[PDB]
Design a protein around this ligand. Sequence first.
Ligand SMILES: Nc1nc2c(ncn2[C@@H]2O[C@H](COP(=O)(O)OP(=O)(O)O)[C@@H](O)[C@H]2O)c(=O)[nH]1
Ligand SMILES: [Mg+2]
Lengths: 171, 338, 131, 158, 141
Amino acid sequence: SRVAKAPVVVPAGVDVKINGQVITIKGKNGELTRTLNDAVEVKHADNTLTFGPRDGYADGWAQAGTARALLNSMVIGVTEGFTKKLQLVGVGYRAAVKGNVINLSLGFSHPVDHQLPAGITAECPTQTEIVLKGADKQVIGQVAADLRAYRRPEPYKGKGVRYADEVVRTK
Amino acid sequence: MKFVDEASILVVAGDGGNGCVSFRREKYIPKGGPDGGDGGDGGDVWMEADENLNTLIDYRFEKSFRAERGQNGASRDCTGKRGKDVTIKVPVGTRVIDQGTGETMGDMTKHGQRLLVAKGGWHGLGNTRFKSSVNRTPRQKTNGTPGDKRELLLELMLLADVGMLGMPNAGKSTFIRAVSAAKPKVADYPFTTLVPSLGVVRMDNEKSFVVADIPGLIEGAAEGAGLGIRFLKHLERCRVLLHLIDIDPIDGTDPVENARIIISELEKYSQDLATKPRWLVFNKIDLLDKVEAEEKAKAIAEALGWEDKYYLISAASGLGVKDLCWDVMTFIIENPVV
Amino acid sequence: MALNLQDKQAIVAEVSEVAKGALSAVVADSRGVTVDKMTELRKAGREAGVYMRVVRNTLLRRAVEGTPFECLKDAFVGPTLIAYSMEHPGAAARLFKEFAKANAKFEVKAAAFEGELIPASQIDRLATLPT
Amino acid sequence: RREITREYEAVAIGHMTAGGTVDEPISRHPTKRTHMAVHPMGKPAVTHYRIMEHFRVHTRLRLRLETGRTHQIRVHMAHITHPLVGDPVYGGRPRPPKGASEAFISTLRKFDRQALHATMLRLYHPISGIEMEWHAPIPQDMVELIEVMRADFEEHKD
Amino acid sequence: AKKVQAYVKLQVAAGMANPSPPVGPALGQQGVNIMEFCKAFNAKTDSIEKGLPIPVVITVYADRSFTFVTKTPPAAVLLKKAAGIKSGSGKPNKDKVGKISRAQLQEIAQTKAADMTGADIEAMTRSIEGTARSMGLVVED
RNA sequence: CAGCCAGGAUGUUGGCUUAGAAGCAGCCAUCAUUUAAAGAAAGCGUAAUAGCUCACUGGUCGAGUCGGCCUGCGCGGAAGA
Ligand SMILES: Nc1nc2c(ncn2[C@@H]2O[C@H](COP(=O)(O)OP(=O)(O)O)[C@@H](O)[C@H]2O)c(=O)[nH]1
Ligand SMILES: [Mg+2]
């Protein structure tokens, strides 16, 4: 509702492709294309985007607000870049990146090799930490979530892999 | 595994399976024998020790334990199954007390001992057991015996082979930072350690002993001074008692009377701890000169009437900690439990 | 917010102070400190006491309402946070330059000490005041 | 007023667990004229019992009786289906334990009386007001009864 | 007065010599020793009197020593020696504990060295009594 | 209204039970005066300490927000050969 009312400004160097409903917001930091629920259309203005609902649909403003936020997740990604921080704490935990895959010595009997998607790269400024850089929220969140699925920290010592933003409670 | 708590629970034993009355009726004949059987014996309660459990935390969570009630009798001369005996996992060294001039049931010293606490009720009788010629139609049945009910005061008390008591912030937890593998929280403030984190020392194969931690306390008969009798209860199976006295406290008073009153309050706890052999050791010797703390160490002994070796121990510095362990271990071996 | 009784009274009291006001300064304490709050206002209590008002209500429809009635040229407070420091005794007292001198005293942002409009002037560093 | 305290020593059957109190009204047996059975509409009664040590299938126990009516202690101990040892009138049918020695079975045959004894009595002097305390030595039959049970318990269970 | 700078304050009295049972070695553990309590702390306190507890900031950043300044004692620690009883509250409000006159805590409250919120003397005249009647006292202003 | 950028301080470590509790174990007379927009205060983390916070206000966004009442149609409550 109110989210759709607010206009959104697009930066320079990024183009907006309109082919009906499919939209391309390719910029200086990669390319991506996303689709809506066939209920909210897109219109191009001088420096803003207006979407609007369509009659006959009860939800209406409900999914229209999701549209801008969906664009908001991919208008600054191709301009600023998205970085998520993951912390590995514990004795014997090893983390490194090789090529486009990550090898983790998390205490398994065999090393864990996870294949990263094409549009997301990884780097380890220090051995015990890793930074994830991507172009869209939807994939980068899951990749970080998948990493935590191996070592979801326990509430006793916090040992395992965890995001830097959240704090693991100890009991 | 960071807190110790004690509470009381209510155990109830299932009464026996009640008898049944019935009369078999076939598809053609309407008159049949007095069908029916007995009940099921009530489920008992067994008091079993456990290594993994070390507190009574679940017992505060669950104050009531229900045994399986015996199944009632059924037709076709059916007898109900005996109620399953509920087994309760308890840390070793527990003592249990009842009401109404109650007393202890049995001391647990080793794992594997199973103690009988509650006897379930015993099954009743059906009409078939009352078979006779003159009656010829038994409508009588015997009610199951009621189960046994009692309230248990679960007292947890450690298997401290070597028990030690010392002055507040005298380094009792620091003494565990020695060869002892336990890691109690250590800090300069008084009563740093409140939870008893017992440790174990293994000098060599076939020979080891456990050491418990009990914080110091001020002279109070009641629960005053924060700490008191609730911590002294973990004692009373310590074959050796260790006394720790500070030398030249940084801010406290030098021990000339406070080291004597702590002995006096031990007398009034319950029985002076059966006058067990108490060993007095010192601490805080690396702060001053080694030779300076020699003459003043023995001066305290006759000041308090102590005629023992008055061992000088540096818990933090680690000098002499091994010498005390050798002496106590020989004393332990030469005096087995008998 | 509560009902409108105190809002009218608060502005009316502020308006009545304009008739007996003097030169005033401004400050933008977006990141303020209570310790600093007890420096430029303890001086206000040092002079006479509690009479000094530093109420900060520079909203587009809170302090602007009294602008047409008194000091019409002060309509340019519509932009971002601006505070007032009104002096009843004396004409052009030394408190005007206090904020400018205290700008570097852990008060990095002080609304550029644009001041008020006694002579209908612009942003300046005024130090010639009756002492 | 129930001021005088009375103590009894008794031996019963069964592996006891803990003491307690029994409060059951009692009247005459409906059928047999030599039995005094528990009746819901009987005379109210209070009795307390404690335990000093257990045995194989028997026990040695100390208890206090409040009202000294006819055979009060036996029925209240028998109302919890734990009858006295050797009692022919109120105790249960003979039930020797599993793996009992021949000497043990003879002792129960030899001890053919009721298992009851009073040890400690407390009284208040009539014209002085000073308590007296007296104790009764354990009778010889009970000495051997607990002796044979102690040997049997220490041999079979151990 | 600039940032958090890990400031703590604890004391029981000024007439003592840093006793252990009341407070102990908790007078500093992040670079503050215990032997310096009688070198510079007892430089101005010992000059006048030791009869009122004094809280004070740590102010230690990277040096072994300290660079703090002592401040005024609390308003209620004086209620024991120059106002009346000293046992404590006892019954909080079951009855009237004591009586406080306007003469009391009037001129002594001005003895504060650096503790002031405005020059209005009347402001803290009734604010020093603000600490009062927290135990069952009666004001007679 | 909810968000974002900040304020959260003061006489003040609030008196007894207090070893240690000082908004966060036990009692509130519930103080009020300082600039005001903020309470001797509802929650983490320990023993307080130190820090995270909240009601509240200031600035920006700029048009509905808040939960009680009656009622139609719905959802879970609803597992068997
Ligand atoms: N220098 C030195 N310090 C010690 C020694 N023993 C204990 N301490 C210190 O005493 C402090 C407090 O000891 P604490 O664990 O509180 O003993 P408690 O009072 O019995 O609980 C610790 O921080 C140790 O650093 C010693 O032998 N030498
Ligand atoms: Mg210790």
